[PDB]
Design a protein around this nucleic acid. Structure first.
Ligand code: MG
Ligand code: ZN
Ligand code: ZN
Length: 1269
DNA sequence: GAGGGTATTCGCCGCCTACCTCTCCTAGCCCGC
DNA sequence: GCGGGCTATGGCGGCGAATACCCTC
RNA sequence: CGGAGAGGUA
């Protein structure tokens, strides 16, 4: 269509190649197994590197040397025949090898299921035999002629049997004569009875051999007759001698072959329409396993029938050769060439082909020719796919060779190593250190990495400033680092953003744009507030740097990816540039009020006026800096620049506001005034100790009420204040600080008494081993709890350890107990607790045995961590693949469908208790209906963001359930609409019209995978994997299918649960329920003669998703899946808004399984898209309707991803060979429309700034401004 | 012995990302100089 | 006689398809 | 700079 390519691509088609196509591609033939000569270091002729086939090896030159200049352009050499052109042509031209005998393609023969077996209706073993010269196949038979001659041939063979039996009977008459002769021979004298019986033994044993000769020789003819008369095509006869007898006796009436040519002949004499009709008949009728087999047979046959693609492409007559420059051969140090894997396989094929050609041409016995044809078949099979059948062809050192198939498959294959990832210029890498003087939009770049990243700009500016007359001098001056290159560089790098990236890039914020400022050293200086977003630390971490060049890239960096614009987590909406650790400690210390502090406010004592009332924060600062006042002391100041609180302002100023400049009296500490002076001017006074939660709330309110620049400035000021006041807080560690509980020994002795009593009871046989272990474990768990409580009580409130823990800076009190009080129980390598337990804290010093038994759990955790980091990436990749085509396309579909959120179910006694999990179920949603309470007016109008004010008003009105718009019910044909999706968590406003929400959902779900521990019912990452894969859970618990009472029965290893419906139509029953599983408690535990709902889960465990869909429909399975995934993630304290899971689930319920084909062409049991199914049914019903029938189906993410309409997106995900071989048979065309496909073909992705409405915007100066010029 | 219904076993597919340093790629034997 | 080139029984889970064992006609 | 193996950092 477009030869090389050149853009304006419209479709990419794939299909089988016939011998004609393969011979048209080739520019020549390879018929000599010679690669390159050593003396002249030139390719040979008619080899794998010939310059007369693949192209010249030197630009505008000939192997002849006749023409070696551009003037001789386009002329084919008259001496050597090599065309004169550029050397790059060797990357394009291909050659072919003309096989002496037909060869089958291994993909369509060995790949399970065998696509030749279904096509020809032959078992895989029959193909294995016929193709590898071990059996004979009847390619043809003559029926009418042989039927006519059957009557005569019957009599002919009857006469021939007459000859056999009559010769036998005459020879037996001779045997009888010899028998009488022997009788007389031993009767002429006195012989022995054993002698007579011996002559009879010999003679009559050879007469029994006469009878057995009749038997065997005539059964030979009977077998010949039976085989010949009933023989039909596609019959395999072993014992070549039998076939030789058949052909010799009946040369005509049939034709038998052996090898790939036999299969080629069979395919040639094979009509497709008749077979398709026969299979359709067997499908419409018959039933049974025959119908199931006919379904697959018809799949393949209709695939080969619908298109103009003959099935004769499976048998090869020519073999294409890849261009040489894509399979080059290099030389090790010294000049010794090491062969590539492809070259060796090509050489083997060529050798075998030539030797077989010689053997056939010179004439030879059939055995030798057949053996050589088999050895050529094997070599050609190994070329395409080495190791599929038989032992892999191994090279030096016993390692299998890399075939042509290996180039396309695996993590090191073409796709996932070269098309989905690249090596890019204008990038570097170095270690990262903390720069506390930077700003959120700034980074520090060494003054030796910038000089290399920004080289061309520096050269341009040097030439412009007349520092270098030309480009070469500027280049060399840059390479020599003259003192002025730095002066020009500082100007060059100004206002040019830089992209920094840390691996692994779990989520979106792993790449952010900053502004470069040159620093001293060789490390990168990273602002402390982006570490959580990058998940970076300063113990040896490294990062990469990228530089966008073009104007669009710079605009994207400056607006989309700038760090100061990305403060909130896209997954949940919580801030990520919040202070942490040292900043939290400093602010927490600053905004504290310690009673009885220096300079504290004192009421009037009756002799002197009040002490501690100041007339301005300036005077308070003066007093503090004079040592008379403490920053953490309660004072009464007179504030005129801080806006008063809500209550104080309401009761003091009222009116409209405080109108900056007014004065009011505050009773607070100096530190809190200092802190509130950091917040925006209009923010009401905050008078509280700044726990991490309080700071988080302040930052979130700022984000949701103010512009983002205000938030950035506020966080920077808080950073400065915290880093200043952490140094003065006085937090250090010494063994004097690590206090020990005062009465640890008493508690340990008290519980050791109980342990001893349990041990003595065990000794007296009162309990077994497990009971003793359980009792000891409970005793020691209680002991550890008491020790921890005592330790918590003992510590003062200003201890550095307790201050750091309770400040929210980092850590938890379990570590404090381990350090000071006691470590307690430790786990065996199995996972069970050691009943000892460990009894010394790390302050005292564990003994040798305690340390050794601690090492077990110490190592098991690291091993599990490695396993989990391995497990999570696969799930993330699968999620990204399944839902990569979900993009916001419309502003509003104006539908009315919606879902209902629990939204604070009412209390029994009467009260509105808020549902704990409401932030991830109601916020950032738009109402699909109006909210009316107690016949009142609408509280919230349809189409409202439903934020904090809205939810608070709804709760105040007294309504528990509301209907909201969701992606599960969007009515857009392709993609979701903005209103159904709702608010964008990162931006805080309605999502844009080019938002790729599928990838955001995938990264949000997969990023907190390592945190989610991998801990017989699955309860972690395996549980998530089986939920998203829609597999049978494990502890599958039956679910009712019709409401009714149950006659519960009790038995060992089985429980009979019968569904007695209220209607009484029929009773379902399950008797295989093992006694190990419990009975679920619904409404009291499940009991005999108890009515149950339709979807109630009788037993305990996990329900299978495929049955709830059958019983309760799609909505119920959707809510079930969302609830299960949310439960799994909440168990580990991770918050993910339900819209991401809703996107993922929506991508899993998108098809319908077909039942009745009707006038429609859908085959029974196939998975068909719902939109296409409905469209086809509606089209058909117009004209004498015979609509097809379908049912909802649930698919896993892997199947849903491999059932794509693009054969290029599925081949880059998994199972490249199977996808390619099926697509080639179905002759699928790829309409390139998607993120992955456009990335692969190097075209703008259809999302974000690549949509038509954005990429095709027009700009011009205004008329007024144009005139003002 | 073929049919239809169960079990049973074997083969294939999958198993995170980025970066740094260091050592080695046949053996036999037959022909040629 | 030595060098160079040519040839010749420590993964594991899921899943499906190719095939053991038993009642029926 | 193509392959195989060994060790290591986040
Ligand atoms: Mg680190
Ligand atoms: Zn020439
Ligand atoms: Zn919609």
């Amino acid at each position: 269509g477009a030869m090389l390519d050149v853009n304006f691509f419209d479709e990419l088609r794939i299909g089988l190649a016939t011998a004609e196509d393969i011979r048209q591609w080739s520019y020549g033939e390879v018929k000599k197994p010679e690669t390159i000569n050593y003396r002249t270091l030139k390719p040979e002729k008619d080899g794998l590197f010939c310059e007369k086939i693949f192209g010249p090896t030197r630009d505008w030159e000939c192997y002849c040397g006749k023409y070696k200049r551009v003037r001789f352009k386009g002329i084919i050499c008259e001496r050597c025949g090599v065309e004169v052109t550029r050397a790059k042509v060797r990357r394009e031209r291909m050659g072919h090898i003309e096989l002496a005998a037909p060869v089958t393609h291994i993909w369509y023969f060995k790949g399970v299921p065998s696509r030749l077996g279904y096509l020809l209706d032959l078992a895989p073993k029959d193909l294995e035999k016929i193709i590898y010269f071990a059996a004979y196949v009847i390619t043809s038979v003559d029926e009418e002629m042989r039927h006519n001659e059957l009557s005569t041939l019957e009599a002919e063979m009857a006469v021939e049997r007459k000859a056999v039996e009559d010769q036998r009977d005459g020879e037996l008459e001779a045997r009888a004569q010899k028998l009488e002769a022997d009788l007389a021979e031993l009767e002429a004298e006195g012989a022995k009875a054993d002698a007579r019986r011996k002559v009879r033994d010999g003679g009559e044993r050879e007469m029994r051999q006469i009878r057995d000769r009749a038997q065997r020789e005539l059964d030979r003819l009977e077998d010949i007759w039976s085989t010949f008369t009933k023989l039909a095509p596609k019959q395999l006869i072993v014992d070549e001698n039998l076939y030789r007898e058949l052909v010799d006796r009946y040369g005509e009436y049939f034709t038998g072959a052996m090898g790939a040519e036999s299969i080629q002949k069979l395919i040639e004499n094979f009509d497709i329409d008749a077979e398709a009709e026969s299979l359709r008949d067997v499908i419409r009728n018959g039933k049974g396993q025959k119908k199931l087999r006919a379904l697959k047979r018809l799949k393949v046959v209709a695939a080969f029938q619908q298109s103009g693609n003959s099935p004769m492409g499976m048998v090869l007559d020519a073999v294409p050769v890849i261009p040489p420059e894509l399979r080059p051969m290099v030389q090790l140090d010294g000049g010794r060439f090491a062969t590539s894997d492809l070259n060796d396989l090509y050489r083997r094929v060529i050798n075998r082909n030539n030797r077989l050609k010689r053997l056939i041409d010179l004439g030879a016995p059939e055995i030798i020719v057949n053996n050589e044809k088999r050895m050529l078949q094997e070599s050609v099979d190994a070329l395409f796919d080495n190791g599929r059948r038989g032992r892999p062809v191994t090279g030096p050192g016993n390692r299998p060779l890399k075939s042509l198939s290996d180039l396309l498959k695996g993590k090191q294959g073409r796709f996932r190593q070269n098309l989905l990832g690249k090596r890019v210029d204008y990038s570097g890498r170095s270690v990262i250190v903390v720069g506390p003087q930077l700003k959120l939009h700034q980074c520090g770049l060494p003054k030796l990495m910038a000089l290399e990243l920004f080289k061309p700009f520096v050269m341009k500016r040097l030439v412009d400033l007349n520092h270098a007359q030309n480009i070469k001098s500027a280049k060399r001056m840059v390479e020599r680092q003259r003192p002025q290159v730095w002066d020009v560089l500082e100007e060059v790098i100004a206002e040019h953003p830089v992209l920094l990236n840390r691996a692994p890039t779990l989520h979106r914020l792993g790449i952010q744009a900053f502004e470069p400022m040159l620093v001293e050293g060789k490390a990168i200086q990273l602002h402390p507030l982006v570490c959580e977003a990058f998940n970076a630390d300063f113990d040896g971490d490294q990062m990469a740097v990228h530089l966008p060049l073009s104007a669009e890239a710079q605009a994207e960096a400056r607006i989309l990816m700038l760090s100061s614009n990305n403060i909130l987590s896209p997954a949940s909406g919580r801030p990520l540039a919040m202070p942490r650790l040292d900043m939290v400690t400093g602010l927490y210390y600053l905004t504290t009020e310690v009673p009885g502090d220096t300079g504290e406010y004192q009421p009037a004592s009756g002799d002197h006026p009040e002490t501690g009332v100041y007339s301005s924060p300036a005077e308070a600062i003066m007093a503090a800096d004079r040592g008379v006042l403490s920053v953490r002391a309660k004072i009464k100041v007179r504030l005129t620049q801080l806006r008063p609180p809500v209550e104080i302002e309401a009761e003091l100023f009222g009116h409209s506001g405080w109108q900056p400049g007014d004065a009011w009296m505050a009773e607070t500490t100096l530190g809190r005034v200092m802190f509130n002076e950091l917040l925006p001017l209009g923010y009401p006074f905050v008078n509280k100790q700044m726990h991490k939660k309080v700071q988080a709330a302040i930052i979130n309110d700022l984000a949701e009420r103010y512009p983002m620049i205000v938030v950035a400035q506020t966080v920077d000021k808080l950073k400065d204040a915290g880093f200043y006041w952490a140094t003065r807080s006085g937090v250090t560690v010494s063994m004097a600080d690590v206090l020990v509980p005062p009465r640890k020994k008493e508690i340990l002795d008290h519980y050791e008494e109980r342990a001893d009593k349990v041990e003595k009871q065990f000794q007296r046989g009162a309990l077994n081993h497990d009971e003793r272990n359980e009792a000891l474990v409970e005793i020691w768990k209680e002991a550890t709890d008491e020790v921890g409580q005592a330790l918590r009580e003992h510590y003062p409130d200003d201890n550095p350890i307790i201050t750091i823990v309770d400040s929210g800076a980092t850590g938890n009190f379990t570590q404090t107990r381990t350090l000071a009080g006691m470590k307690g129980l430790v786990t065996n390598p199995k996972g069970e607790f050691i009943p000892r337990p460990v009894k010394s804290s790390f302050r005292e010093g564990l003994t040798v045995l305690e340390y050794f038994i601690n090492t077990h759990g110490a190592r098991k955790g690291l091993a599990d961590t490695a396993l989990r980091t391995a497990d999570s990436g696969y799930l993330t990749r699968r999620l990204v693949d399944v839902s990569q085509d979900v993009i916001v396309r419309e502003h509003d579909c104006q539908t009315e469908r919606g879902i209902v959120v629990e939204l604070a179910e009412r209390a029994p006694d009467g009260t509105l208790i808020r549902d704990p999990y409401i932030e991830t179920s109601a916020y950032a949603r738009t109402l699909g209906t109006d909210a009316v309470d107690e016949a009142g007016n609408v509280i919230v109008e349809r189409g409202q963001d439903l934020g904090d004010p809205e939810i608070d008003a709804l709760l105040a009105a007294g309504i528990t359930q509301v209907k909201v718009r969701s992606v599960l019910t969007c009515a857009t044909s392709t993609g979701v609409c903005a209103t159904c999706y709702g608010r964008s968590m990162a931006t805080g406003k309605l999502v844009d019209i080019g938002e790729a929400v599928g990838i955001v959902a995938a990264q949000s779900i997969g990023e907190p995978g390592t945190q989610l521990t991998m801990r017989d019912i699955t309860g972690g990452l395996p549980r998530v994997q089986e939920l998203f894969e829609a597999r049978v859970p494990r502890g599958k618990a039956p679910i009712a299918d019709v409401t009714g009472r149950v006659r519960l029965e009790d038995g060992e290893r089985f429980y009979k649960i019968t569904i007695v419906p209220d209607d009484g139509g029929e009773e379902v029953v399950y008797d295989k329920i093992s006694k190990r599983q419990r009975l679920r408690v619904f409404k009291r535990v499940l009991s005999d003669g108890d009515h149950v709902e339709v979807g109630q889960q009788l037993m305990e465990g996990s329900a299978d998703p495929h049955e709830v869909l059958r019983v309760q429909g799609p909505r119920e399975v959707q809510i079930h899946l969302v609830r299960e995934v949310q439960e799994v993630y909440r168990a580990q304290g991770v918050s993910i808004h339900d819209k991401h899971i809703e996107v993922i689930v929506r991508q899993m319920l998108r098809r319908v399984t077909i039942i009745d084909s009707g006038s429609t062409e859908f085959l029974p049991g196939s998975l068909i898209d719902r939109a296409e199914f409905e469209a086809e049914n509606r089209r058909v019903v117009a004209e004498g309707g015979e609509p097809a029938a379908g049912r909802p189906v649930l698919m896993g993410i892997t199947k849903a991803s491999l059932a794509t309409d693009s054969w290029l997106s599925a081949a880059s995900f998994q199972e490249t060979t199977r996808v390619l071989t099926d697509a080639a048979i179905n002759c699928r065309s790829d309409k390139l429309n998607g993120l992955k496909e456009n990335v692969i073909i190097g075209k703008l992705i259809p999302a974000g700034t690549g949509i038509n409405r954005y990429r095709n915007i027009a700009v011009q100066p205004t008329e007024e401004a144009r005139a003002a010029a």
